[PDB]
Amino acid sequence: MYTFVVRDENSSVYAEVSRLLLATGQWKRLRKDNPRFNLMLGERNRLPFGRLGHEPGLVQLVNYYRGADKLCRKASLVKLIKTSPELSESCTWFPESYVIYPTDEREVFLAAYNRRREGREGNVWIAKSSAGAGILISSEASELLDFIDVHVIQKYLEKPLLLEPGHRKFDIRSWVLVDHLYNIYLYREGVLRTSSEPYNSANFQDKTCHLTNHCIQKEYSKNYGRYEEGNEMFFEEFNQYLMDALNTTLENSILLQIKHIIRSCLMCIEPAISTKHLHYQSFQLFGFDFMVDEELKVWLIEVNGAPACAQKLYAELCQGIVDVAISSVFPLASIFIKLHH
């Protein structure tokens, strides 16, 4: 008989994991502030890691990796990619980005902006922050900085891969689970969050065709759900399209770069967040978001530390969390691809 607590009522993923644990007849849910728990489904902000692993006779496990915010924050991610030799400034799968405060990189961001100005190359950039829904897509630097007045500005992928029919944009969300042993498990089932509006490179003011967000597409797009239900195209349909349209597979053209990017990011911070010899153990579910350009190159946009799953996949994924992440530590009485390292 195992015990667990719930400290994030707004967690759609672990609300299902909690329901599954109880349905096993071998897990007992306690009060949120009862310390004698085996498993903590902790909160997102100010989770007290310092109070974990001090209960004699209790193997305690938490569903978050302390220090993983370095990877799941706009400015943190940029700083971690530029200042880490394992990733280096020469990182070829991350868009050229800069951190600007309303340290600061105002003079560095403009240096590369003038070089592209004279070069006549695509000089469209995007500025975003970790408190967004609000973003600004402009080709003039003066408008980007006046808008910010912490933020980060990176090159806007001007030539993205466009699905047909539709001539539209999209992004790929990958769910990755890391257990207490730091095994990297990539969920087989991904989702393409597509824009139902044709990509118009002339005007960036109308962000319905540029932002593939599920909320922005259901509020500012008239063709929501026209091509696929909920602007969500799963891997089966996307794979067949790439075979019919480009004579290639999702595994070869895209999935190899995604698996590479996932390893590199999680392997980089491993020494800083691993709980191998720690008095408590950690696991965490991550949400990676990629962009695919017209040349079938994959780019990393950001990593979400508290991601939500797709409706159809909630059941399968949540059951997989219990199997490899929870039951592996507390045994009772594959849908993942193990990224070895």
């Binding site: 015990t3 009060r31 502030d33 009862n34 004698r36 004699p56 006779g57 209790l58």
Partner: protein, 423 residues
């Protein structure tokens, strides 16, 4: 040399107290004549907590025997270990108390209390470091209940900075001598709420049920009931009579067990309770120890919450496995332990087991479910008081109905206080 002064008052107090000294005297190797004939120095290392060392290397119990009738005390002086008591420590009258709290507290008892205090003073004056006092008595009678609480009040006045500890037998209609027992118990409980630091609530109803249901005794006698109390008293005082770190004296016990001054009424439990040569594993001791059927208060712990718990394991056993099982009980049923008192369960171990057992476990719980015991008494009290039934026995001794109304309100207050900490 933290000495404890023992007092036993009334029929029940002296019959239970006599068995207690018979039990612990055997554990420490002392014979009925006061001579030591043991085989372990652990028996003597703290023998002075309860015994005085006399001439010729004789150990004399630091006990004072009090009663308003000579009957029961003549039985003790003629009992097995009757010769071991200090003759000067027998203080008794001739009239009795007629199961009347007023007689023991205001009339008959008042005439005799000064004599008892003179004996207590003599015992305390020769104490190197007096911890306090422990009183055995019932609350249903007249002497132990009425005079016992009078003694406690006068002892506190003369020794305000000493711990007051009592073993108090609560009345039950199942094992009842007279109908006025709820009256006497209600009046005594208020005295205990104010003037004791630790009170082990021993319910004659629980003792009977255990003897009948568990021990399989069809016609339980008081002797059978006193076997349970005798073994329980030895268990709860193990940490006081043998070398140890946890709850080794009365004050440190009180500091660990009493988070609020008035909520100092404990539920004691004992394990095993066999009807007998089988070995009992550490997991088995722990489960029985926490099972309500082994509780002496007749209160369901699952109806309340544990403020604090003191566990004592006796015998040669895996102290590692003891830690494991104890942590297992708390972690398995953490909902029954208040979360605003972290680590409120303390566990001690004593190598010397009780007579006739390879290993045992004594449970001491401060549970809010003890309110069930006080509610029970309060209902029985009110059933008669609403008709002023049997009051003339008390008004004839000078008492006024107001004192009953106040005792009634004091009791219900205590019940309310327990209820506020159960939510």
């Amino acid at each position: 040399m933290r000495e404890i002064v023992h007092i036993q008052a009334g029929q029940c107090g002296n019959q239970i107290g006599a068995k207690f000294w018979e039990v612990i005297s055997d554990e420490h190797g002392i014979d009925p004549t006061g001579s030591y004939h043991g085989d372990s120095d652990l028996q003597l290392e703290r023998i002075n907590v309860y015994y005085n060392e006399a001439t010729g290397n004789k150990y004399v119990p630091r006990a004072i025997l009090v009663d308003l009738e000579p009957g029961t005390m003549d039985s003790v002086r003629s009992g097995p270990f009757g010769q071991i008591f200090r003759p000067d420590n027998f203080v008794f009258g001739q009239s009795g108390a007629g199961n009347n709290w007023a007689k023991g507290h205001y009339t008959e008892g008042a005439e005799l209390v000064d004599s008892v205090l003179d004996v207590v003073r003599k015992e305390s004056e020769s104490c190197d470091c007096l911890q306090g006092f422990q009183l055995t008595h019932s609350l249903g009678g007249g002497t132990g209940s009425g005079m016992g609480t009078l003694l406690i009040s006068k002892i506190r006045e003369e020794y305000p900075d000493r711990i007051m500890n009592t073993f108090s037998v609560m009345p039950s209609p199942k094992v009842s001598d007279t109908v006025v027992e709820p009256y006497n118990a209600t009046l005594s409980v208020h005295q205990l709420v104010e003037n004791t630091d630790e009170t082990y609530c021993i319910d004659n109803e629980a003792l009977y049920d255990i003897c009948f249901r568990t021990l399989k005794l069809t016609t339980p006698t008081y002797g059978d009931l006193n076997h349970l109390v005798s073994a329980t008293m030895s268990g709860v005082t193990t940490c006081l009579r043998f070398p140890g770190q946890l709850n080794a004296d009365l004050r440190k016990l009180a500091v660990n067990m009493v988070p609020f001054p008035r909520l100092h009424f404990f539920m004691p439990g004992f394990a095993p309770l066999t009807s007998q040569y089988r070995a009992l594993t550490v997991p088995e001791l722990t489960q029985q120890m926490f099972d309500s059927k082994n509780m002496m208060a007749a209160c369901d712990p699952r109806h309340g919450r544990y403020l604090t718990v003191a566990a004592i394991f006796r015998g040669r056993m895996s102290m590692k496995e003891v830690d494991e099982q104890m942590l297992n009980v708390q972690n398995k049923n953490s909902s029954y332990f208040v979360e605003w008192i972290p680590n409120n369960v303390k566990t001690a171990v004593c190598d010397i087991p009780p007579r006739g057992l390879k290993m045992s476990a004594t449970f001491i719980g401060n549970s809010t479910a003890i309110q069930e015991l006080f509610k029970r008494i309060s209902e029985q009290f009110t059933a008669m008081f609403r008709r002023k039934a049997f009051l003339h026995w008390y008004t004839g001794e000078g008492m006024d109905e107001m004192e009953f109304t106040e005792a009634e309100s004091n009791m219900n207050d205590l019940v309310s206080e327990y209820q506020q900490y159960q939510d």
